[PDB]
Amino acid sequence: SISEIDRSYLLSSDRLTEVDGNTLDVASEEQVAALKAQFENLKDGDEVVIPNGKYANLGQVTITANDVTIRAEQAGAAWLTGLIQFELKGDDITLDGLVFTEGGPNERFGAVRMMGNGNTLQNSTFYYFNHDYTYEPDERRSEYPKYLWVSLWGKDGKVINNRFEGKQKRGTLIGVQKDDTPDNHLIANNIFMDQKPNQFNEFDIKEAIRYNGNSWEAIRIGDSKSSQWDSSSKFVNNLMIDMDGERELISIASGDNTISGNTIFQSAALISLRHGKGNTVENNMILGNEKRLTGGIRIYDEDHVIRNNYIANTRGRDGEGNADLRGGIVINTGIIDVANGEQLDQSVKGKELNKQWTPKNITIENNSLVDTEWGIVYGNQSHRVSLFNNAEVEGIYAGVDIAFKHNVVDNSQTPEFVSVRATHDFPLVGATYTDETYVGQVTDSELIESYSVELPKVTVENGLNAYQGEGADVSKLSVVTAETAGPDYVLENTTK
């Protein structure tokens, strides 16, 4: 039952063999090289079956062969430590059952660089892989380096049934480095936990905070330069626990993506549609469990579909009129006049692709927000010129053509909570409301054509509130636990 869910419940499974660090022996400097040659000499169709044990500092491992599989002999029993990067240049390469821990990426784009087509990372575990690379404020502006753990640079990549635990230095955990055509990557059934910033005093450099406090997402799909092309990639059926990297939990920066059916539990970070068009966010379960700085989905740019999400028990910061509030659904302001067809454009100074595309043409329907401190927030935030230029942008615009239908914001338990935060500072343009139900405070409610303040009949189905005829259909929702997400083993005797 939802309120009573905890880390223990989501991560328990019987199906999970336990692998223990100690039954593994530390390979000598000599067997590492022997392992490395095996890697580098493999031919199309071959397979390496890493014998069990701990292998420190493989360094740079380049796989040039196609149709190969590198697996541990027993899943979870080959531990790759110190500095390593697998560089997967071949097509149809599969990594399976590996553990990356007690070490760090050998180059900043991660332990695994998936450069080929149809590359796969499955059944693998990353555990606090934060070590052994240089990590200092740089001389130029005191910026700490961005290190990722996995990056995808090819097509049809798969990252499935892994565990990604304790990323706690700067850098996005999975990055998609794409080009001008669809990538169709699948990132699914993974477990993500305990991403967290400022564990090494990074924020102590006050002047550098805006950038040092950025780039701690769990995944970024696309980036500013590539954002106006489709990725058509999927972030689905993942389980995320205490993922507190930064404001963006998932930063979508390309088009036609699906970010659907994830369970996001006690994670002080939001799904963020940051750049790019026509992304779909559906059937997620966002369970704040009353943790401060939790929230649902924040939205820039055009043509997105946000439907049938279940967002509960989220809470904003502890005690500014203009604050970028974390709500269940946040319709951001941006810096371009989209109501008159303005676009971001790499050629127009101040309006480059990495800036803020005022949301437009957004479908928001059949969501259930339950006990959310800030429910649906219509943004009034300002923006800075860039991460390196602190000047505020003059020229801020509200969302346009935002269609709300069949949403339930239920703050019946604490009706002082703000269910809808409308704002005369930036009235939405062309907003419409069809069968909305908002229970709880509505700020600037005279901005809203109509809505009901009485809940439909409420039932409980497998722990969820079901509102008759409205809100998220509970038939489409279910909690992801370690019964389908994550590797088939847990590791014991690991070190952070």
Ligand X SMILES: O=C(O)[C@@H]1O[C@@H](O[C@H]2[C@H](O)[C@H](O)[C@H](O[C@H]3[C@H](O)[C@H](O)[C@H](O[C@H]4[C@H](O)[C@H](O)[C@H](O[C@H]5[C@H](O)[C@H](O)[C@H](O[C@H]6[C@H](O)[C@H](O)[C@H](O)O[C@H]6C(=O)O)O[C@H]5C(=O)O)O[C@H]4C(=O)O)O[C@H]3C(=O)O)O[C@H]2C(=O)O)[C@@H](O)[C@@H](O)[C@@H]1O
Rule CB under 5 A: which residues touch Ca ion?
214, 248
The stretch among 17-25, 195-203, 208-216, 366-374 that binds ligand X (CB under 6 A) is 208-216
Rank residues 386 and 441 by Cβ distance to Ca ion and give the closer one. Answer: 386
C-alpha 73 chain-centroid distance: 31
Verify binding: residue 13, ligand X, rule CB under 6 A.
Answer: no
Amino acid at 75: A
Q: Which of Ca ion, ligand X, none interacts with 382 (beta carbon under 5 to 8 A by kind)? A: ligand X
473 binds, among Ca ion, ligand X, none (CB under 5 to 8 A by kind): none
Both tokens assigned to 247 = 């404001």
Tokens 């700067």 locate to 170
CA distance 479 to 357: 33
DSSP 77-111: -EEEEEEEEEEE-SSS-EEESEEEEEEEESSTT-S
Least separation in angstroms between residue 354's CB and ligand X is 3
3-state secondary structure of 4: helix
CA separation for the pair 369, 467 (Å, rounded): 11
CB of 123 to ligand X, least distance (A): 25
Residue with smaller CB distance to ligand X, 251 or 465: 251
Nearest residue (CB) to Ca ion, 79 versus 149: 149
247 binds ligand X (CB under 6 A): yes
**The three-state (H, E, C) secondary structure of 400-411, written as one string:** EEEEEECCEEEC
Q: Does 324 help bind ligand X (rule: CB under 6 A)?
A: yes
Q: Which residue lies nearer to ligand X by CB, 54 or 155?
A: 155
- Interaction mask 68-87, ligand X, x per CB under 6 A: --------------------
| Of 365 and 373, CB closest to ligand X | 373
- Are 220 and 272 spatial neighbours (Cβ–Cβ below 8 Å)? no
Among the listed residues 108, 105, 250, the one whose alpha carbon sits nearest the alpha carbon of residue 190: 250
Binding test (CB under 6 A) with ligand X, winner from 85, 381, 437, 465: 381
Among 16, 49, 385, 387, binds ligand X (CB under 6 A): 387
**Of the listed pieces 136-144, 170-178, 307-315, 343-351, which binds ligand X according to CB under 6 A?**
170-178
Nearer to ligand X by Cβ, of 177 and 411: the residue is 177
Q: What is the distance, to the nearest Å, from the Cα of residue 475 to the centroid of all Cα atoms in its chain?
A: 24
Residue 155: which residues within 8 A CB-CB, separation 6 or more? 117, 118, 183, 184, 185
- Taking CB under 6 A as the criterion, the residue among 64, 363, 382, 412 binding ligand X is 382
| Tokens coding 42 | 């493999």
Residue nearer to Ca ion on the CB measure, 125 or 214:
214
Contacts of 474 (CB under 8 A, 6+ apart): 310, 461, 462, 464, 465, 466
Mind giving me the DSSP string for 139-207?
A: TTT-PPP---SEEE-SSS-EEES-EEE---SSS-SEEE---SS----EEES-EEE---S-SSSGGG-GG
Interface mask (CB under 6 A) for ligand X, residues 272-311, using x and -? x-x-------------------------------------
Residue 173 contacts by C-beta under 8 Å, 6 or more apart in sequence? 148, 149, 150, 164, 167, 192, 195, 217, 218, 219, 245
Stretch that binds ligand X, among 22-30, 128-136, 245-253, 307-315 (CB under 6 A): 245-253
**Nearer residue to ligand X within complex by CB, 10 or 115:** 115
In the bound state with ligand X, the residue whose beta carbon lies nearer, of 159 and 485, is: 159
In whole angstroms, what separates CA 160 from the centre of its chain? Answer: 15
In the bound state with Ca ion, the residue whose beta carbon lies nearer, of 208 and 409, is 208
Q: What's the rounded Cα separation, in Å, for the pair 102 and 397?
A: 47
Residue burial 457-485, b: 16+ Cβ < 10 Å; e: rest: eeeeeeebbbbeebbbbbeebbbbbbeeb
In whole angstroms, how close is the CB of 226 to ligand X at the nearest point? 8
Query: In whole angstroms, how close is the CB of 181 to ligand X at the nearest point?
Result: 17
CA distance 306 to 282: 6
- In total, the chain counts a number of residues equal to 496
Residue 419 binds which one of Ca ion, ligand X, none, with CB within 5 to 8 A depending on kind? none
Tell me which of ligand X, Ca ion, none is bound by residue 291, counting a contact when its beta carbon lies within the kind-specific cut-off of 5 to 8 angstroms.
Answer: none
- Using CB under 6 A, which of 130, 172, 294, 358 touches ligand X? 172
Of 36, 131, 146, 291, the one binding ligand X (CB under 6 A) is 146
Task: Note the Cα 291 to chain centre separation in Å.
Answer: 18
Q: Give the residue with the Cβ less far from ligand X, 169 or 274.
A: 274
Count of residues engaged in binding ligand X, rule: CB under 6 A: 25
Q: In angstroms, give the least distance from the CB of 450 to Ca ion.
A: 36
Q: Residue 32 belongs to what H/E stretch? A: helix 29-41
From the list Ca ion, ligand X, none, partner contacted by residue 323 (C-beta under 5 to 8 A by kind) = ligand X
Residues paired with 36 in a beta bridge? none
In the complex, the smallest distance separating the C-beta of residue 11 from ligand X, rounded to whole angstroms, is: 28
Which residues of the shown chain bind ligand X in the complex (CB under 6 A)?
146, 148, 172, 175, 177, 210, 214-215, 220, 223-225, 247-248, 251, 272, 274, 320, 323-324, 354, 381-382, 384, 387
